[PDB]
Design a protein around this ligand. Sequence first.
Ligand SMILES: [Mg+2]
Ligand SMILES: [Zn+2]
Lengths: 94, 55, 101, 170, 147, 14, 221, 1112, 56
Amino acid sequence: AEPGIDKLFGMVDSKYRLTVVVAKRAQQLLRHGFKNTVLEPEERPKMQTLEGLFDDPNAVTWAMKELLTGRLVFGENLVPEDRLQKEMERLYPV
Amino acid sequence: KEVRKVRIALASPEKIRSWSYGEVEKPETINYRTLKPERDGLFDERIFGPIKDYE
Amino acid sequence: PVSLETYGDFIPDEHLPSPVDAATQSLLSEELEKALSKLSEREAMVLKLRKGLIDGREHTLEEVGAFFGVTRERIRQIENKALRKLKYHESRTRKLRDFLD
Amino acid sequence: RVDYSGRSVIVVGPQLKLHQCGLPKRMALELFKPFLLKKMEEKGIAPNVKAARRMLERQRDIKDEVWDALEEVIHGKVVLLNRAPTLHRLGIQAFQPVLVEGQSIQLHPLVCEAFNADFDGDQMAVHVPLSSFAQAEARIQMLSAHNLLSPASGEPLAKPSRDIILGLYY
Amino acid sequence: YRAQGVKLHDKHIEIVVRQMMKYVEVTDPGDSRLLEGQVLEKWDVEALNERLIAEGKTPVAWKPLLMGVTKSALSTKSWLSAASFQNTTHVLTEAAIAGKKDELIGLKENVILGRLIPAGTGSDFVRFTQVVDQKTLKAIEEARKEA
Amino acid sequence: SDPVRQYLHEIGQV
Amino acid sequence: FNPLYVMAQSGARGNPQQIRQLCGLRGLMQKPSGETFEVPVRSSFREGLTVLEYFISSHGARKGGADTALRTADSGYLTRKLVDVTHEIVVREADCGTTNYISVPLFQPDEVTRSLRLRKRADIEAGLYGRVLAREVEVLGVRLEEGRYLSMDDVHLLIKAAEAGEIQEVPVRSPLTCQTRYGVCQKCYGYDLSMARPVSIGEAVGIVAAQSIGEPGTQLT
Amino acid sequence: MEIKRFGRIREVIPLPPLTEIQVESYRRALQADVPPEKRENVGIQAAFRETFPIEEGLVLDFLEYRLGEPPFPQDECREKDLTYQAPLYARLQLIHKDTGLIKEDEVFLGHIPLMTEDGSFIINGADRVIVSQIHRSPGVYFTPDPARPGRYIASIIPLPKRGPWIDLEVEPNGVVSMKVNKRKFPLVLLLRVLGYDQETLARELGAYGELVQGLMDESVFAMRPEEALIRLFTLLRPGDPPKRDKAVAYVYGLIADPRRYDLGEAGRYKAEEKLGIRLSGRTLARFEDGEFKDEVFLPTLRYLFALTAGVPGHEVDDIDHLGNRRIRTVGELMTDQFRVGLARLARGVRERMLMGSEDSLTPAKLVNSRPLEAAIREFFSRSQLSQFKDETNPLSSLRHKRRISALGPGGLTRERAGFDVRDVHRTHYGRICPVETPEGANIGLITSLAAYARVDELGFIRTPYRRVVGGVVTDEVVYMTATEEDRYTIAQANTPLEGNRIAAERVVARRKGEPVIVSPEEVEFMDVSPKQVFSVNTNLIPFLEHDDANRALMGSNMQTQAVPLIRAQAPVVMTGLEERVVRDSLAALYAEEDGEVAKVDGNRIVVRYEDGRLVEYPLRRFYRSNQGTALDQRPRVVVGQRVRKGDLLADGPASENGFLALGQNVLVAIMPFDGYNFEDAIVISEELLKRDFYTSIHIERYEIEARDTKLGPERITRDIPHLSEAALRDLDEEGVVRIGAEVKPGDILVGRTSFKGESEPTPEERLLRSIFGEKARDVKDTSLRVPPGEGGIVVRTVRLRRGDPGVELKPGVREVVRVYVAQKRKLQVGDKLANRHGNKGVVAKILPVEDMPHLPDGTPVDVILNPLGVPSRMNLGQILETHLGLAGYFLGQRYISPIFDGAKEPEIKELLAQAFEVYFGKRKGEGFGVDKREVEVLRRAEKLGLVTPGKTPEEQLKELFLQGKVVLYDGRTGEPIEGPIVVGQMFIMKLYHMVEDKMHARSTGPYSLITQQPLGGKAQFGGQRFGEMEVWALEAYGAAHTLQEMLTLKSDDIEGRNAAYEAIIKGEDVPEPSVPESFRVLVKELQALALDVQTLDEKDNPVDIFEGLASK
Amino acid sequence: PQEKNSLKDLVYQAFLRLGMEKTARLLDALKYYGFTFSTTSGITIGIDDAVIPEEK
RNA sequence: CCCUCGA
DNA sequence: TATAATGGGAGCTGTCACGGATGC
DNA sequence: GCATCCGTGAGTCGAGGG
Ligand SMILES: [Mg+2]
Ligand SMILES: [Zn+2]
């Protein structure tokens, strides 16, 4: 099973809201090249290559683990969409 | 715009003629030697548009 | 002729471009724009006018020459030097070779 | 009918974890092929995409590094497994694929009961969710280990059966 | 179902049956534009009756109507759903004549048009949800704070 | 029902 | 520890009837007319049948097969009908706020019509578990509150109270009584039987219902 | 090795030729060997006799016909994709009535397909089989009215498309009604037309009270037969002018015309027998001396009234009874379509007699052969009873030729077929097998002919019985119809016999299918053998009596699915039918007469017979069958060997020394293994691959064409633009791959170039062209390449060129090249295995030999089967087969155990004892005692009640061995299996379903024209179908974007799919999906229906999904 | 003795807490050990394992 | 398409 | 472009349940 | 108010051959 899936289902009033949050966050991480991540270098999801451990390419993995850290804010009408876009482009260039 | 609805109703002959880019006057499809659409036929390029892009 | 209803499920569309083909043309246009960005604006524009990447058609040396306000020999020479720099850059980075099929 | 899909015979997976399924290498190579190309361009396996695709085209042109590349590609991702007929929603489930040798799809034992799947020669279809949204939906909602119970009853759906019960009882 | 050892929850059957009871027949038109014997949805006639009672008019007298799943399906408001189900010709004739509009409420309608279904992740309830990290959130907060 | 029969009858009128 | 006995008892494989056909007598058989033959197969599969026995048994088996196929077709049709009639139904809201409900009886009239006796556990469970109380229920010194999602333990407790004669029926929120338009609410639907918890808004319970009713259609004999 | 056979029942007669149904039907049909004057009026001769004479020159008549030699031999027809056929010439004479002029000529009617020696056909190079049809026999039937109790329906049924079904019913108002072509009218009218008078009807039918009074109508008897006739014609033909000759012609055509209305010979027979009358012709009435004369109707009505009244000697009919159901064989069907094409030919002939010069006409001028040819071609190609032959193994073909279908032309339509038709009738005994039949929708509709069963001249199936007189069983054998059978008391074949006399005072018999215990004095007849109850395939299952019918069925069918193996061996446990199955399938080669073998080769076998003549038998070698299985004959004899008549010269495919080999004999252990045999899955030893057990040869055909186009010709050449030498390496000078070359997916089988379509180069193409300074070539690479997942060694190349001797292709085609590729297939994971008892599974694991459970002597098992399969499936035959297989393993012998006659338990126990003596005796001889692990195991079994406490280890081990169980050591541990395990030899087949064929995956590929959705099929590299129910699934998970992905990006959304692919190769996220194209197609197809479909916003203002391109 | 029903109930309670998560894990464990012990058990089918009672 | 064969 | 020629020919069957109009 | 004819339905995916 997905790690801490239970706690995640506990976070939200509907499981589908969890899904949306996770997917959206994953898209944010893809877009900005994981420069917006709230995960400390030791908290980074890893992948075992032939060479050695590298960053987990999967943005949804990242999204869920981020979500579990309590460092993400979700909900409806938090901020204008274009304002969010522009500020994320500001802080983390693409 | 975003589609919020789908409507269906009867088509007036005037509406039908409004759709039409031409009348098909001939029961012809394609020429036997040239394999190209016959004029005023079911496959006519004059009516239903070009076979080749931008040509 | 015979009927599609005896059948047509086995009949592919050769007309519309495959996603692979379309992606290939896209990457082609983009790469071309890179290699042309490696040139000056005038010579790149001359190449685009002469090969018709702008309005869709190929202008003569008289039309491009009268466009930039020069002689046809001059504009042909510009086309040639542009093509030459393109050949040097391509020989160097070997980027556009794969698109030649 | 859809793209990014495949099918093959199913075979028992006993070593598999519940969230996993064996996916033949070739199948995975084809299904994920664009991702594989992009990854091959990210590493030094190919200068560009077209060269990489022309490289995968012939089977004798396929080397060892592309498989590791494919492994990197499918990491964390899930595929949809489906057996016909689909009577209820558990006719489709999500699995993190494990690349295997051979042409057969490996299926975890428990979920068999839901699929009404046995090893008398049943075949199954594979599907690849593309978007982050699709894969999120699949992993959270459609994962095998995330549905343990029947939506019809509320009794356990994935449960010990056959050999398992026999052993534990024994 | 019990006879065969199939454990099945009542509420599903209750869903279906609920859809079987979905329609009513008019015993008296009252002050409405409705006709005697005219069949419509219980919801619609209840709304109509609440409107007539709120207007001080005489409400519509109606009768409960039980129809099987096929008839209940074909009698639904969405012409797309009904036409896709079966008896396509009939459905389409009556729909075209009535100049019917499909509001795209259910799953079939949006599936045909290839839209995002109104269920699960597509639910208007959960689909407008936003996600932001505390850094970006605070930056935006300062942006709002300055003006 | 049958167009041929009908036209043949109509022809059998004259 | 006999293999057949072990497998049958455990639930790994086999039922008493199959075991009976192996060890015991094969049993009675039906004529093609549905009529039953007077002379049973006295033989087991262990001992082996005579060709006559085998022939009769063949009547039976053929009948069974035809039955199975035709059944598959009709069940499929039914399932699609159900999917078409129920598909617009989704959980669109938390509560419609209706005061309406249904009362699930814990007792059913005896066929002797002597008295009322307790309903079978599984059926009670099937009409109770995962539902929501429309009213306060106080039994055996326990408060089951209005709005409460009934757990399995809640159901079993209600059965205990029933046996103690404290409660003959349970008031419950139901899709039948839900005033939600185009779908049902959360409280009226109750649990998501897959997650053993309350149903998430956006769940399509119409399709889930259609599939739940449809899937064991080919098992119905 | 020594073969011990069991059973006490001596079969009086052997199995009849098993292909005889086909061969003799068609031989009866053509009558090619019969000199024309001696030909019977049956067959195509019949069709000629019905069609001719042709009148209104005035007259064209039929003299005789003949069949010439085939233009090409069978193999050559298969090669060139022709039809194996013979030319049909018919001698006709034209006669002018007035002139007296007679012009006679032999005209060419086209060809007719010739049936091969094994009962098949070659149609356009493909082997095909015409499957017999089963249908209700023509005749007069009486059935109970479902609505009205006590009332019955009379039904007069002729042959299919021989004219209408007629119903006679007694209406609630009392009048007797006749129903023809869905028209209800009083029968009395027709009775008047037939020339009957009220007097005759009163004396004849008056014996039945209150019945005949419904038949009395004064208005009908008030008019002569002519007036009544015209009345009937006015009733049956509204609006049509009631002319006298037109009415006479119509009714005569409906009833008395043999050219139109024909009861079968069978129909006539059954009518005569039922109604107790005699029919002059096969029609219901006659036209004689200007008036209609009755045959059928009055006896039919008489029987109806009699049955209605309760009069004894009158009963209803069972329409599923095999006395009332007959079989239409290949000859009858072919003859029917022949009659059709001939009728069309006749229409053409009269049409040609009306137009053209009247004085000069020849038969050649009047006859256009084409419609007949067209009819026959339609039959042998597009008919439903004409099926692609199953060549997978020989038994496949044999069974295919023995099939019976209720479907087809004139047959039942599915889903209208209830339980009754699929049911097993009591009359099925000895005739139609109760076991072999498909699973699913076709169940009971497709069936198989019993082993001893025969089809008679009237088309009824007959089964043999033995005469029993005074308790003495003779060798006299009588084949009976189901009716004749119902006339007798027939004892079972296992009935005790001392000499020819019945030794039991209580015998088991049947009376009308009803089982009954009777005296020897009462026994009229006795069964030939249990074999006669079952089909060929079902007869190949040993210990069948220990198997439940369903898994027996599975065993049969899967036996037909078995793949020929290079090393394939005959079963250790046989039913004894294997040799005959090989012989009758014409798979193997036999000696025609006694003689000495002169030459022996992998190619030919030359034999000198007693006549002194030298005959050379060529061997078919590595030929590709219809299903792609390898067909090759291996010589079984050596130079100088003395052979007698019927001895084996060579083994065919799936044959070992004349015995049918559908698979391998492997050593199995019944026990779970670590979840790998979970749910019917199977585990195998790698040793099986090492010695090449279950290894098969498969050949695939690849075909390309070079044709003339308007843009210039396609051509096969070694010059292919933009290709290296590496790709052209194995290509020969002409562009064809060389023999012996290994091909892999992507490799070129045949090089081909086609001129490019007219091309306006995109500006990018022009620029790039100018950059690399290379002219774009005129042609492009069309070459035929090896498809994904295929490949092998090229064993053959066929090239056919236009402008070359003996070669003329389709118009426009320059040449055709065929490439044959053979592949050797090892058994691999996903491949399907089965036994004859219905146990089937895919191999889920292949273990290295060191991981396999093994006997103490170090012998590893081959296959590991999970016991959990056995109890619910209730097939114990595999168990007994396993025990006896163990015995035969250590005794080095094979066994023949006839069904229901087979080896019983005690005999198997004896053999197992001997085997144990070999096993353990050898052990103790070698100087080793009992192993400790064996002791532990023995303690466990001692606790299990398997062995007697107090006995020595050897005694207990023997006790276990007789139970079929042995001590087994886990290969990974060395620790024994805690209990003893059943281990023995089992016969297992490798089924035709192989994962190599079935594995498919697609990223992107071809899309359909109109729908712009992915194509279906593996060959077309299609996408899987996501159907209504899968969409239901995704809806139920509530996954919206995955679903939307299925409905747009991955299928019919062009913008969406292109954007998606590009986004993914760029490394981006897939974009928002657009409108699906097939919905636009829906909008447009709805517009053509004059329906306006508008996509609107929330403000009800139109939205254009066509982006302006559809608007003016 | 552990059989179909008991194991099912185990999976259900466990399923509540141990639950979703550790019931995924528990399911896998039971699978493993179940298969192993089934293998070493000695389970097979002989013809003498179908036992005709004399009572018959 | 229909037929046949798989699930 | 001229003897006169003047109403066609297929037929094809062993299902069942519902709505709807149609006929005593 | 009750029989009778007419139209429309009757599981999925997969394979193969035509
Ligand atoms: Mg299966
Ligand atoms: Zn509610």
